[PDB]
Design a binder for these strands. Structure first.
Length: 175
RNA sequence: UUGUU
């Protein structure tokens, strides 16, 4: 597939980029290798992990299948751990998720889904409830794209007041 | 009791 950066743990601290390139190139072409370093004192030191960026997702997956939880590098007591790097995380859920406040306590998950369905696909909708299943009068709504969440906010924030509520509905990005 | 899982 397209390029992807993988985080790799249980790499011996003595290994450099050269050693890592050699290992990974067995499975697919490597764009870049970067050993994570600690510069807190002299000299800089490997943190025992690296990033490897493969040109294709296919290569990354083949390396993962071959290595993750399978290959134990020299001196290690656990096998390589490999997964996509944090920097590759794209649609953080946290940035696509709305807090909906001041909704009626009678409001159902389905009620909220319907109210907000016109703005995009809703991947999740949860009413916050207390111990006795009573609504806390608020919800979380996750859209598939933040774009759809912004659209809902502009259209729905304080647009109406629901049954039993002291103020208009609150629609905003979740904390 | 405006309540952010």
């Amino acid at each position: 597939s397209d390029a992807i950066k993988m985080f790799v743990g249980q790499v011996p601290r003595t290994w450099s980029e050269k050693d890592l390139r050699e290992l990974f190139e067995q499975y697919g072409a490597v764009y870049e290798i970067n050993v994570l370093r600690d510069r807190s004192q002299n000299p800089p030191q490997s943190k025992g992990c690296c990033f490897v960026t493969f040109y294709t997702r296919k290569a990354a997956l083949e390396a993962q299948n071959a290595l993750h939880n399978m290959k134990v590098l020299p001196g290690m007591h656990h096998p390589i751990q490999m997964k996509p790097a944090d920097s590759e995380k794209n649609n953080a859920v946290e940035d696509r998720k709305l807090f909906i406040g001041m909704i009626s306590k009678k409001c159902t998950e389905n009620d909220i889904r319907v109210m907000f369905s016109s703005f995009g696909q809703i991947e999740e909708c949860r009413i916050l409830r207390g111990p006795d299943g009573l609504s806390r009068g608020c919800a979380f709504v996750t859209f598939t794209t933040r774009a759809m969440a912004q659209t809902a906010i502009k259209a729905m924030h304080q647009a109406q007041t629901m049954e039993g509520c002291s103020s208009p509905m609150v629609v905003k990005f979740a904390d």
